[PDB]
Amino acid sequence: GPGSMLTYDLIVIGFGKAGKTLAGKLASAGKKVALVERSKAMYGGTCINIGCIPTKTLLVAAEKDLSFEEVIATKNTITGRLNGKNYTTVAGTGVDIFDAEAHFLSNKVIEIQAGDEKQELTAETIVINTGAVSNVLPIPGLATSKNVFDSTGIQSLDKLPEKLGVLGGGNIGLEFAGLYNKLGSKVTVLDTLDTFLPRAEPSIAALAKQYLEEDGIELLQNIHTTEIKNDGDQVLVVTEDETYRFDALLYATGRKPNVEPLQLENTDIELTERGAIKVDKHCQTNVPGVFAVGDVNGGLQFTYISLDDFRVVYSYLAGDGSYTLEDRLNVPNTMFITPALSQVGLTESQAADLKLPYAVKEIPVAAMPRGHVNGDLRGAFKAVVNTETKEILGASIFSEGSQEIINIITVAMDNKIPYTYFTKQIFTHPTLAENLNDLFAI
Amino acid sequence: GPGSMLTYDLIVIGFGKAGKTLAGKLASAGKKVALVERSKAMYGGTCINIGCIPTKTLLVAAEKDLSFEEVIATKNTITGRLNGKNYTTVAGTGVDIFDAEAHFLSNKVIEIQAGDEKQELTAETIVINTGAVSNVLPIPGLATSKNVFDSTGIQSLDKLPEKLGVLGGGNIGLEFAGLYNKLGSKVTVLDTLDTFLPRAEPSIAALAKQYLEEDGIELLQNIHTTEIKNDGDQVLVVTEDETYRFDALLYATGRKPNVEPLQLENTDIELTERGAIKVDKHCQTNVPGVFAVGDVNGGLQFTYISLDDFRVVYSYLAGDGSYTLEDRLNVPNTMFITPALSQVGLTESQAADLKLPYAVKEIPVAAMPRGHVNGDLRGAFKAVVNTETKEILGASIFSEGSQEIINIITVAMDNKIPYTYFTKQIFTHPTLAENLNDLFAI
Numbered sequence: 016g017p018g019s020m021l022t023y024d025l026i027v028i029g030f031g032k033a034g035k036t037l038a039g040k041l042a043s044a045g046k047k048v049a050l051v052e053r054s055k056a057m058y059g060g061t062c063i064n065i066g067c068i069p070t071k072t073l074l075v076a077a078e079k080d081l082s083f084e085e086v087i088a089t090k091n092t093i094t095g096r097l098n099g100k101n102y103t104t105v106a107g108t109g110v111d112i113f114d115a116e117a118h119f120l121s122n123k124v125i126e127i128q129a130g131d132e133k134q135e136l137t138a139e140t141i142v143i144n145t146g147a148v149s150n151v152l153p154i155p156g157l158a159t160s161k162n163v164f165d166s167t168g169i170q171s172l173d174k175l176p177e178k179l180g181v182l183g184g185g186n187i188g189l190e191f192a193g194l195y196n197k198l199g200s201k202v203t204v205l206d207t208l209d210t211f212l213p214r215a216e217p218s219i220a221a222l223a224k225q226y227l228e229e230d231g232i233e234l235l236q237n238i239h240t241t242e243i244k245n246d247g248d249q250v251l252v253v254t255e256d257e258t259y260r261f262d263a264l265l266y267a268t269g270r271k272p273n274v275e276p277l278q279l280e281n282t283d284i285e286l287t288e289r290g291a292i293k294v295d296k297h298c299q300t301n302v303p304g305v306f307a308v309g310d311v312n313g314g315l316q317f318t319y320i321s322l323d324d325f326r327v328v329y330s331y332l333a334g335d336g337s338y339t340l341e342d343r344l345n346v347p348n349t350m351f352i353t354p355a356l357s358q359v360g361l362t363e364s365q366a367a368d369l370k371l372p373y374a375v376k377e378i379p380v381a382a383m384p385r386g387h388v389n390g391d392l393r394g395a396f397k398a399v400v401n402t403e404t405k406e407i408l409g410a411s412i413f414s415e416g417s418q419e420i421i422n423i424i425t426v427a428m429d430n431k432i433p434y435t436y437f438t439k440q441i442f443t444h445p446t447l448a449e450n451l452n453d454l455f456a457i
Numbered sequence: 458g459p460g461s462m463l464t465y466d467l468i469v470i471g472f473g474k475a476g477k478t479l480a481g482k483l484a485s486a487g488k489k490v491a492l493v494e495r496s497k498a499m500y501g502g503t504c505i506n507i508g509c510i511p512t513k514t515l516l517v518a519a520e521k522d523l524s525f526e527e528v529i530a531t532k533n534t535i536t537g538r539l540n541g542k543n544y545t546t547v548a549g550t551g552v553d554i555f556d557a558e559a560h561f562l563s564n565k566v567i568e569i570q571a572g573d574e575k576q577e578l579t580a581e582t583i584v585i586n587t588g589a590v591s592n593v594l595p596i597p598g599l600a601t602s603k604n605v606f607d608s609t610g611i612q613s614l615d616k617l618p619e620k621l622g623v624l625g626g627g628n629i630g631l632e633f634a635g636l637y638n639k640l641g642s643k644v645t646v647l648d649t650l651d652t653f654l655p656r657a658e659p660s661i662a663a664l665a666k667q668y669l670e671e672d673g674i675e676l677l678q679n680i681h682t683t684e685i686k687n688d689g690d691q692v693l694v695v696t697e698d699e700t701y702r703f704d705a706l707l708y709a710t711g712r713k714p715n716v717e718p719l720q721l722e723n724t725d726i727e728l729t730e731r732g733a734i735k736v737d738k739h740c741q742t743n744v745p746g747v748f749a750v751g752d753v754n755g756g757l758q759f760t761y762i763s764l765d766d767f768r769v770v771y772s773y774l775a776g777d778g779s780y781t782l783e784d785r786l787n788v789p790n791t792m793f794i795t796p797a798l799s800q801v802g803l804t805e806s807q808a809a810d811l812k813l814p815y816a817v818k819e820i821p822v823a824a825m826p827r828g829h830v831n832g833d834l835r836g837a838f839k840a841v842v843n844t845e846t847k848e849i850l851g852a853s854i855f856s857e858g859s860q861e862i863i864n865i866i867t868v869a870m871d872n873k874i875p876y877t878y879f880t881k882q883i884f885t886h887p888t889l890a891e892n893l894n895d896l897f898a899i
């Protein structure tokens with residue numbers, strides 16, 4: 016028969032980054048903790064299974080002597096191991112992991128299916144960590160044509176598509192274009208926008224466009240699609256001036272908070288106008304003791320932002336609440352094209368818009384000895400500084416290893432270190448990082 | 458006939474790092490500057506032509522689909538271009554570059570051969586930047602046997618040696634062992650010392666030994682050589698218990714200040730007991746206005762230390778002398794085995810010896826998601842901190858990209874940032890650097 020409602024100190028909904036971190040921390044401290052996750056293919060969350068880890072594992076594998084099928088299998092081995100490592104690490108702290116989709120019956124009661132019965136759970140603290148789901152554009156035929164995939168489906172194709180279309184121009188789409196180009200596909204990116212990489216420094220965007228085109232990718236702007244349909248197994252993308260034909264189509268046009276399954280109408284929890292779970296500076300909803308962390312609260316969609324939401328909630332629950340969303344320091348980013356394009360802080364354009372007293376300096380990797388050592392002259396560094404306060408406003412690092420190097424910048428920005436320090440730092444040599452000695456001699 | 462003595466504001470002896478930097482800086486500012494360099498194969502100095510740049514260029518090339526001869530030619534292309542880039546950048550500032558070996562006639566007069574005549578030059582400031590030369594052990598037969606090379610000769614072998622011996626166990630020897638092993642040689646390292654990598658953390662040295670042996674290198678300790686001789690073209694290294702046979706032998710047992718050619722007996726300039734040019738905190742000799750920078754002053758032998766000696770001398774000549782050798786901050790190092798082994802600050806053993814209130818933490822790369830993404834689980838991170846002051850005392854980063862990552866640590870050590878900051882920094886993901894969030898949760 017059915018069980019009586021189970022009471023925990025904390026319930027986490029979703030095996031996301033903030034949630035699994037908070038759950039294990041409090042279970043290790045002796046609290047009674049439950050974590051509810053709808054899919055065994057998602058133990059450890061989006062980054063482990065469908066996001067950060069498989070995407071970058073596929074790109075590393077594609078540079079090696081492996082067939083398409085071997086690259087896919089390598090990705091499955093790596094994500095499968097981390098999936099099991101995450102389940103077992105969380106359960107090993109004492110967290111009770113439930114395999115079900117949770118929905119709310121009231122502010123702090125959830126229901127799950129548990130075999131032939133429903134089971135209810137409650138707690139004093141509920142942390143909603145349900146992530147996001149792919150946007151699907153309302154283009155007629157997109158959702159019903161064969162060989163059309165989102166960013167998850169594209170990771171499990173049966174064979175290499177000879178021609179791959181990508182609809183959208185963000186980090187995700189461009190990383191997959193780079194991947195499939197390496198694997199051997201003829202790749203065309205179709206973007207509605209006029210400007211390629213409009214958030215990047217223009218000089219850096221121009222280099223990126225050059226390198227992607229050199230590598231054989233076709234980058235199209237101002238593309239307005241009226242319909243998607245099939246011709247046999249192939250996909251036709253019908254646009255104003257041309258119909259494009261592909262063996263597979265990826266769409267990558269954003270992801271939105273995953274809130275529908277929760278049945279929030281059964282609670283007092285408020286959504287934002289855009290559909291995210293609304294939170295205050297402590298990631299708390301308007302219901303006391305109910306929080307929302309990671310992508311579902313509408314914040315920046317990176318695993319490291321979900322991790323920092325754990326720091327905010329843990330500060331409020333276990334500490335004195337002194338670290339809040341209003342205190343968050345600098346947030347870098349990387350897009351793993353070839354080479355990686357990394358950035359932190361303000362661009363020149365952003366500093367100009369704020370009327371700050373700024374200066375910039377740019378050095379191409381082609382002028383750097385380590386670029387010659389590497390046999391790879393792609394990329395550039397660009398720094399943006401405030402000539403009055405001596406603060407570093409931002410930097411772009413587009414180069415081999417930039418996903419590591421960018422974090423050098425963040426240490427100095429977070430700690431209010433003047434930009435002139437980088438002219439004095441003693442760097443290892445030969446490296447790309449030592450060129451920061453020259454980039455900051457402004 | 459002969460020319461009258463030429464007068465400059467500054468004479469630099471040797472195309473080293475500090476010297477070429479100072480020469481171009483002051484010539485660009487309108488001073489009259491001469492730089493005297495004995496070998497056109499050395500324009501740009503040791504790192505460009507025989508040191509940092511060819512060694513690391515050979516290691517990158519050896520990972521690619523290139524024959525031995527193609528790897529050597531690639532190295533020659535890269536160093537040749539940087540040699541010409543350095544000559545032309547320095548001459549383009551207005552420096553007069555003389556192709557000769559300089560020696561002193563008195564404290565601030567040098568003589569060079571200039572065609573069929575001698576030429577004298579003088580200045581108010583002389584900067585001696587003559588670098589170092591390879592040590593050659595007094596082993597009978599070492600200096601007279603065929604197929605025995607120092608670190609320069611080993612970069613120009615006629616063909617791959619099937620078996621390569623390396624005598625000595627520093628960064629230089631081990632990097633060349635790694636290189637020739639990749640290229641296909643059977644490599645044996647013969648070290649007199651009992652302990653492998655005695656300056657590294659022991660756990661890190663043990664991993665390095667494991668990986669080098671996995672890769673096929675033989676690492677021998679406590680080897681005392683009594684003679685080197687030839688058998689035909691092969692080299693025999695006669696040691697107490699065994700005679701080793703190789704197709705070529707590298708010796709790499711250190712480099713010493715290159716002072717003999719200068720004829721310093723014709724000046725008042727003092728040497729240290731070990732034979733370096735003695736300097737004060739401003740890199741100044743006991744003769745006012747004569748300085749010694751880089752390896753020749755006995756300091757740490759890295760290009761980035763020679764660069765920092767430029768900062769010291771420039772502070773004294775052009776500024777207020779407020780930055781001195783006594784003010785130098787933290788100096789990292791990398792040894793480019795596979796993967797690179799980087800370090801900065803104190804080891805655990807060094808902190809223990811100083812009786813500091815320290816704690817340590819170590820995380821293997823095998824426990825880090827990016828190691829799995831990379832398909833490379835080699836290496837580890839180790840942090841050493843002061844639990845009272847919260848300062849970072851030191852770190853070891855042995856991993857892919859560690860030569861970039863180590864510089865993250867230096868920013869925090871130089872700026873007195875507490876180690877707990879690294880638990881809060883928002884790093885890019887997936888990367889090896891983000892694991893600093895966990896390494897510093899001590």
Ligand SMILES: Cc1cc2nc3c(=O)[nH]c(=O)nc-3n(C[C@H](O)[C@H](O)[C@H](O)COP(=O)(O)OP(=O)(O)OC[C@H]3O[C@@H](n4cnc5c(N)ncnc54)[C@H](O)[C@@H]3O)c2cc1C
Nearest residue numbers: 029031032053057060061066117145146309310316317318
């Ligand atoms: C293709 C791609 C590439 C990316 N690349 C990077 C990158 O390089 N770097 C980076 O930092 N970020 C990257 N991201 C973003 C990053 O993956 C996400 O921002 C982050 O993982 C989201 O974490 P989260 O904590 O919000 O929750 P998630 O990790 O999304 O977890 C939510 C969990 O909730 C579960 N769930 C949902 N609803 C319910 C319910 N009602 N009941 C039970 N379980 C439920 C889901 O099954 C899921 O496991 C990438 C994302 C994608 C898709």
Ligand SMILES: Cc1cc2nc3c(=O)[nH]c(=O)nc-3n(C[C@H](O)[C@H](O)[C@H](O)COP(=O)(O)OP(=O)(O)OC[C@H]3O[C@@H](n4cnc5c(N)ncnc54)[C@H](O)[C@@H]3O)c2cc1C
Nearest residue numbers: 471473474495499502503508559587588751752758759760
């Ligand atoms: C194999 C090897 C690998 C190395 N790897 C690295 C590394 O990865 N990273 C690192 O930072 N360091 C490394 N080093 C060390 C680094 O190369 C040296 O520490 C640094 O380059 C020395 O610079 P310097 O300014 O002292 O002068 P140098 O660059 O040594 O220049 C001295 C110049 O003086 C000239 N000269 C000498 N006497 C006279 C004279 N009487 N008249 C005229 N000219 C003269 C020489 O021809 C030479 O060009 C390496 C060294 C070697 C040999």
